[PDB]
A paper describes a structure:
In bacteria, however, a different strategy employing a class of enzyme known as polysaccharide lyases (PL) is deployed. PLs selectively target glycans composed of uronic acids with a C4 hydroxyl group linked to the preceding sugar in the glycan chain. This enables PLs to operate through a β-elimination mechanism that relies on proton abstraction from the C5 carbon of the uronic acid sugar ring, resulting in double bond formation between C4 and C5 and elimination of the preceding sugar. The three characterized PL33_1 enzymes were all from Bacteroides species inhabiting the human colon: BT4410 (BtPL33HA) and BcellWH2_04512 (BcPL33HA) are hyaluronidases from Bacteroides thetaiotaomicron VPI-5482 (B. theta) and Bacteroides cellulosilyticus WH2 (B. cell), respectively, while HMPREF1181_01744 (BsPL33Heparosan) is a heparosanase from Bacteroides stercoris CC31F (B. stercoris). The enzymes are 68% identical and contain a larger N-terminal α-helical (α/α)6 toroid domain (residues 21 to 401; BtPL33HA numbering used throughout this section unless specified) and a smaller β-sheet C-terminal domain (residues 402 to 635).
Crystal structures of BtPL33HA and BcPL33HA reveal a two-domain structure. The C-terminal domain possesses an extended loop region between β-strands 5 and 6 (Leu455-Leu484: BtPL33HA, and Ile464-Leu493: BcPL33HA), forming an octahedral Zn2+ coordination site [supported by anomalous X-ray diffraction data], along with the loop region between α-helices 12 and 13 from the N-terminal domain. The two domains oppose each other in such a way that a deep, open-ended cleft is formed resembling an active site that would be compatible with an endo-processive mode of action of BtPL33HA and BcPL33HA. Analysis of the five enzymes via SEC-coupled light scattering and SAXS indicated that the three PL33_1 enzymes BtPL33HA, BcPL33HA, and BsPL33Heparosan are dimeric, while the PL33_2 enzymes ObPL33CS and ObPL33Gellan are monomeric. SAXS data indicate that the dimeric enzymes all bind as head-to-head homodimers, generating elongated envelopes. This is consistent with PISA analysis of the crystal structures of BtPL33HA and BcPL33HA which predicted a buried surface area of ~1,388 Å2 and 1,006 Å2, and a complex significance score of 0.207 and 0.290, respectively. The phenol of Y470 moves within 5 to 6 Å of the +1 GlcA and N-acetyl of the −1 GlcNAc, while F475 moves within 5 Å of the +2 GlcNAc, forming the tunnel topography. This differs significantly from the wide-open cleft observed in the crystal structures of both BtPL33HA and BcPL33HA. Fitting of both the BtPL33HA and BcPL33HA crystal structures and their AF2 models to SAXS data indicated that the best fit was for the open conformation observed in the crystal structures. Next, we performed molecular dynamic simulations to determine the extent of PL33 conformational plasticity, using the BtPL33HA crystal structure model.
Numbering used by the authors: 28 to 643
Write the structure that this text describes.
Amino acid sequence: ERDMLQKAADETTLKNVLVMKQAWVPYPAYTDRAAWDSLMGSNKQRLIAAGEKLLDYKWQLIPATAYLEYERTGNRKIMEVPYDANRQALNTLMLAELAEGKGRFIDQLLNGAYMSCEMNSWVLSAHLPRQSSKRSLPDFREQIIDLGSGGYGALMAWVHYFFRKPFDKINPVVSLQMRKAIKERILDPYMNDDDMWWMAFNWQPGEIINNWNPWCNSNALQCFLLMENNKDRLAKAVYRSMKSVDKFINFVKSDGACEEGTSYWGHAAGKLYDYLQILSDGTGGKISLLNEPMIRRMGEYMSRSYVGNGWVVNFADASAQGGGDPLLIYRFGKAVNSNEMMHFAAYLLNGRKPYATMGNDAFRSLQSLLCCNDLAKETPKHDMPDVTWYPETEFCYMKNKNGMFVAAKGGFNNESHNHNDVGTFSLYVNTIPVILDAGVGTYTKQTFGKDRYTIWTMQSNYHNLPMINGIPQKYGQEYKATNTTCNEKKRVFSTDIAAAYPSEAKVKNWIRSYTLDDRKLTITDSYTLEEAVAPNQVNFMTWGNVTFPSQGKIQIEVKGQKVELDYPTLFKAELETIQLDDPRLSNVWGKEIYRITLKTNEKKETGNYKFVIQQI
Ligand SMILES: [Zn+2]
C-alpha cells in the first residue's frame, strides 16, 4: 500500500495539469513532411514498402462460427489470426502513410477503420465469456474491455488523430463513427463498469492482479487523451486509471524482481512503463513516477536476469530461453535514467540497426520512431555488479569475471507459477547452462490443481536440491526458506531450507549455501535431523556430454564449455536420461537432459557435504 500515483496527485491536481487538445502529442503533424522525413530517417523507405504490400489487402471478416468455436473446441486462432492480421495491416498502413504523406494509403486506412466500426466487438473470443451472458460471441448490447479491444481502441484512436482531416474530406461520417465506436467500446465501459476484473477495484487478498492491469489501463488512457476533450470527464478518467494502476504497483515487490520471469517482463513492467510515460506526456511531465527507484529496479530486472545468448534465469514455470524488445528497453532505460538498461538494449540488437516496431501496438510503433536514432548510436555493453540481491523476492545473482553466473533463491513454495525450488541454484558458464533449471512444459489438466506437483518439472526432486531423508519439498505458503542472507562482498548466499520440507522429512535445520569466487562455485550442505530414517539424496540437473572419470568427479561438456563437479566420495553417482517428448522443452534443451543422482547408504542425524564446480 504505497499508493504512489494517488500520492503524486488527486483529481483536482489533474484538472490543473492535464494538457488538452492533444497538445502533448510528440509526433509531427501529418502535413509536416520535412519533420516526418527527419524523424523517420531510413524507416521511411522501409515503412512505405511495408504499406505498399497492403494496397490490395482484403480486410478479413470474422464469422460468428469463429467466435462460437471457442466454446465448441477451445480454438482461439480461428478467430485471432484474421483479427490480428487486420490489426497489423491497419497499424502498418498508419506508419506507411505517416512516412509517405501523399494520400496513397488513405483509402485502405479508411476501409480498415470503417470495417472495424462495423464489427460488433473488438474483444477476443476467449475473453468475451466474461461478459454478462458468458458467451464467446459478441453481444451487441454490451461491451467489455480485454487486452485485444484496448489495443484495437488505442490504434483506432491514433488513426483518428492523424487522419481525421483527409478522412473527412472523403466523407466525415467515417471519423464520426470511429468516435462513437471508441466511445461505446472503451470510454463508456471504462468509466461505467467498476467490476472489470483487471481494474482491481474492490481487490481482495487472494485475488490476482497481473499485467492486464497496466496493459489495459495504458490503452484506456491513450483513448481518453486522444478522444476525450471534456476536461472534467478526462480528469475523472485519468484519476480512475491512477487508482487502478496503484493496485498493481501496490501488489508488486518493491525490490523490482518479476517473479514470473523475463517473458512476462515486456507486458508487465514494460506496460507499467508505458502507462507512466503516457501519464507523464499527458500532464506535461508534472505527474511522473519515472524517477522512482522502484520503477528503475523493475526495468533493470530484465538486464540482471539476462545471462546471454538467449539464456535467462528461469525460476518457476518460465522458459530458460528469453529475449526482449531492445527498443522498448532503451526507451524504458532512458526514461528512468538507467545507462545499464540503455547499453543493454544496444547489446540486445546483436549488431542490427534499430527499425520501427511493427506488430499491432500503436503506442510502441510510434514511440519506436522517436528512439531509433539514439539507440543506433549507443555502445553495446552488458555490464552489471557482481552481485544482485533481491531481498524480498529472495533471488540472488552472482557472477565472476571468468564467465561464471550463478542464480539462487530462497523463497516459499507458493510463488506465481511456483516450482518447489526453495534453495535451488542454476549455473551458467559463458552464458551456457551447465547446472540447469528445466523450466516450463506444455500445459496439461494436471498443471493447476492438486496433481500440479505430480509433473516432474515442478518437483524439488528435479531441481538442484536434496531429498532429505529421501523426502522432497512440499507445495504450500509456509513451506519456505528461513534466515536467507546474501553477503554481496564475499559472494555468499545462504539459506535454511528445512521448513520447505514436510514433517515426514524429519529435519530440524538444513543450511544450503553457495559461494562464488573467481574460478569456482562451492555448494555446501550442513544439516541436523530429528531422526535419521533414510539416506539423503542430492540431485543436480544438466545436459550435454556427462562423464565420470573417477570417484567423485563428474565432467560436463556442453556447447563449447567444460566443467568438473567434485562431490563427496561417500556418494554413488548415477545419470538418468530424461528423453524430452514435450516440444516446449525439447525446443530449448534438445532431445534429452539428465539428472545426476547422488545416493548413499549412510544415515546420521548431523552431517555436511561440500561440492565444487570449476571450468577445465
Ligand atoms: Zn524449475
